Amino acid sequence: GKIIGIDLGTTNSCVAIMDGTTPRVLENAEGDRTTPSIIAYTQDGETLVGQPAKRQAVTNPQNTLFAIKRLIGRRFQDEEVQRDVSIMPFKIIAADNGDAWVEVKGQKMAPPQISAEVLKKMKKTAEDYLGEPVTEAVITVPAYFNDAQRQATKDAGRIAGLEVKRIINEPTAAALAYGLDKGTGNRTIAVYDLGGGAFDISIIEIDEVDGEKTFEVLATNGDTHLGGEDFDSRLINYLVEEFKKDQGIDLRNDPLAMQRLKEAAEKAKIELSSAQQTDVNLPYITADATGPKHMNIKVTRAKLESLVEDLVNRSIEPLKVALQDAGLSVSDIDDVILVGGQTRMPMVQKKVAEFFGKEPRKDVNPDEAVAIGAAVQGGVLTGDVKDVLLLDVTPLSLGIETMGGVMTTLIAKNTTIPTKHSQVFSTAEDNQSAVTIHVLQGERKRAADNKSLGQFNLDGINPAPRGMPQIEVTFDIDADGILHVSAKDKNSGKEQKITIKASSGLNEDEIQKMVRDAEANAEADRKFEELVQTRNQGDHLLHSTRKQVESALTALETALKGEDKAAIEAKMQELAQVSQKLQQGGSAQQQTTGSGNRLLLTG
């Protein structure tokens, strides 16, 4: 069968499919190209999904679940979930394992069983159009999702009876929808995604060589707490302050009124993106001892812009960081893509256009670009789309320099991404206070034959003998392919870190050379590791005795570089007889000859 693309949003979901060569966004059973991400369980035992559920949320607040993406994959005691516990009108509870679950009519349900209801409708939407079963899907997630959030989204898919063939970040999906059928030429794009639940920004390179289009992320970030929800709650606060001032009542203590007020405020926000003024009209919004009370408040676009301007101006500073991290100026960005329903606000479009100096592209639909890109990825997996290349694996092994100029691999070539691997190293010399984490890319055993991706220092290590300190080095490649290298001194807690650009990378011409070069040199590289491993067990023991005095000692400095194992192993036996004939509050003594298997770092 077909592999469908689903944009699984906080607020809205969308299903798309490849129709031979062109993607088509599908209308649900109600004639809508998007479906609200809302699931409701009614008193008479039915499960409503989408617009039918949205329409009755205000009359059935306890049993209508929405914004489950804020909970899926999170622990119940996370502060973000606890803040969420108070404000949401449905019951959020701790599962037996501490996960954040929800409770409806006495049934405890996991967030993925709830999101699966939207996916069952998305699967059904596609099956009605195609006339055959659907079982495979590509589903999108925000770029800030961690490992657990990604697992939970896949889990939701399995419960909906869909096999989730691939997960791809939402900004990457948006670039794929735009990158089919693009006006030819290499372009740099900025994807500005402001949805109901979060802001995410990406800098994405779309290149073209021999008819094949490749997609590479140069930087990505955002703000996980700016979204259409936060625009609403600025308007909500204004209406509360205006009503308190006009009628002396604070609505915040009237749950029935606040549910009505949040929906009225959101529809007003939306309406003011198209009109210059609007009226919020809520009869019987509350009551006190003197009878019913009624709200009728005028909100102009100028007033609205005043309430939320601060949120938009704070979204600009994350773009500058993305440019710093991509090493680019605004002037190198050739196109801007607006994604997300909240970007339809004119102040947002104007404010973004002002930063980049160019008008955002008008042929990318902000509610649909992500789902279409998800459909594109599905078509690549079936082979139906061929001018698309997404690299989901490391092209080359990645590692660090360890004592003796050796490349030590932390993540092997062709490992599926995202992935994360750590290993603990130590210091190479007595009383060494710092180590230089030297990051390398390539297949050779000599560090000097590989590509340097960058380096950094970690300081503050206590004077101690070699091999006694513990330095944890972690390589993390995120799903969008960006490499984060960190180093941590485990006994003190100190940490230093770097991010490594794609530009400091190696190209396909160069990747194929590194692979061809290494196989031809397999025995020679093995020989270098062998004469290193012994060279360094030997300079192991003259550092150990120059410090012990405080002699063929200049003759073993010679016979370390003389590339022979038994040549150093003789200058071992030679100063092993120039030596064989003639406990306080700090580190510990030797007293025996054992050493440890932990690899060593220069610094």
Ligand X SMILES: Nc1ncnc2c1ncn2[C@@H]1O[C@H](COP(=O)(O)OP(=O)(O)OP(=O)(O)O)[C@@H](O)[C@H]1O
Catalytic residue IDs: 7, 69, 170, 193
Q: Between 213 and 269, whose beta carbon lies closer to ligand X? A: 269
Q: Shortest approach of ligand X to residue 37 CB, angstroms?
A: 6
User: What span, in angstroms and rounded, lies between the C-alpha atoms of 443 and 449?
Assistant: 9
User: What span, in angstroms and rounded, lies between the C-alpha atoms of 40 and 54?
Assistant: 8
Compute how many residues bind Mg ion; rule: CB under 5 A: 2
| Structure token pair of residue 316 | 């600009």
Q: Shortest approach of Mg ion to residue 379 CB, angstroms?
A: 21
**373 in contact with ligand X (CB under 6 A):** no
Q: CA geometry: angle at 156 spanning 155 and 159, to 5°?
A: 90
How is the beta sheet containing 398-402 ordered, strand by strand?
406-411, 398-402, 435-441, 451-458
| Structure token pair of residue 570 | 């003789």
Query: For residues 143, 148, 151 and 156, what is the CA-based torsion angle, rounded to 10 degrees?
Result: -90
**542 in contact with ligand X (CB under 6 A):** no
Residue 294's closest CA among 265, 330, 261?
261
Q: Between 338 and 599, whose beta carbon lies closer to Mg ion? A: 338
- Single-letter residue type at 371: A
Say if CB 527 and CB 521 are below 8 A apart: no
**Contacting range for Mg ion; rule: CB under 5 A; set: 3-11, 200-208, 268-276, 495-503:** 3-11
CA Rg, the chain, in Å? 30
**228 in contact with Mg ion (CB under 5 A):** no
Sign of CA dihedral 164, 170, 171, 177: positive
Q: Between 195 and 442, whose beta carbon lies closer to Mg ion? A: 195
Q: Which of 2, 4, 8, 9 binds Mg ion (CB under 5 A)?
A: 9
Q: Which of 345, 428, 542, 560 binds ligand X (CB under 6 A)?
A: 345
Alpha helices in 491-595 (DSSP H): 508-520, 522-549, 555-561, 565-575
**575 in contact with ligand X (CB under 6 A):** no
Q: Between 343 and 394, whose beta carbon lies closer to ligand X? A: 343
Q: Shortest approach of Mg ion to residue 445 CB, angstroms?
A: 46
| Tokens 């999101």 sit on residue | 115
Within 10 A of 86 (CB to CB), how many other CB atoms are there? Answer: 7
**Contacting range for Mg ion; rule: CB under 5 A; set: 6-14, 30-38, 129-137, 172-180:** 6-14
| Structure token pair of residue 553 | 């000692």
User: What span, in angstroms and rounded, lies between the C-alpha atoms of 599 and 540?
Assistant: 12
What are the phi and psi torsion angles at 76 (to 5°)? -60, -40
**195 in contact with Mg ion (CB under 5 A):** yes
Q: Which of 149, 214, 224, 273 binds ligand X (CB under 6 A)?
A: 273
Alpha helices in 248-300 (DSSP H): 255-271
**266 in contact with ligand X (CB under 6 A):** yes
**340 in contact with ligand X (CB under 6 A):** yes
DSSP 252: G
**10 in contact with ligand X (CB under 6 A):** yes
User: What span, in angstroms and rounded, lies between the C-alpha atoms of 371 and 25?
Assistant: 8
Q: Pattern of binders to ligand X over 37-56, x per CB under 6 A?
A: x-------------------
Sign of CA dihedral 226, 227, 233, 238: positive
Q: Between 222 and 442, whose beta carbon lies closer to ligand X? A: 222
According to the 3-state scheme, what is the secondary structure of 322-363?
HHHHHCCCHHHCCEEEEECHHHHCHHHHHHHHHHHCCCCCCC
Q: Shortest approach of Mg ion to residue 353 CB, angstroms?
A: 21
Q: Shortest approach of ligand X to residue 266 CB, angstroms?
A: 5
Q: Shortest approach of ligand X to residue 302 CB, angstroms?
A: 16
Between the alpha carbon of residue 485 and those of residues 153, 392, 482, the distances in Å are: 27, 19, 10
**36 in contact with ligand X (CB under 6 A):** no
Q: Which of 5, 9, 50, 111 binds ligand X (CB under 6 A)?
A: 9
**222 in contact with Mg ion (CB under 5 A):** no
Q: Between 228 and 395, whose beta carbon lies closer to ligand X? A: 228
**Contacting range for ligand X; rule: CB under 6 A; set: 10-18, 115-123, 129-137, 204-212:** 10-18
Q: Between 132 and 310, whose beta carbon lies closer to ligand X? A: 310
Q: Which of Mg ion, ligand X, none is residue 270 near (CB under 5 to 8 Å by kind)?
A: ligand X
**341 in contact with ligand X (CB under 6 A):** yes
**Contacting range for ligand X; rule: CB under 6 A; set: 80-88, 179-187, 263-271, 550-558:** 263-271
Q: Shortest approach of Mg ion to residue 9 CB, angstroms?
A: 4
Binding interface with Mg ion (CB under 5 A): 9, 195
Binding interface with ligand X (CB under 6 A): 9-12, 37, 69, 195-198, 227-229, 266, 269-270, 273, 340-342, 344-345, 367
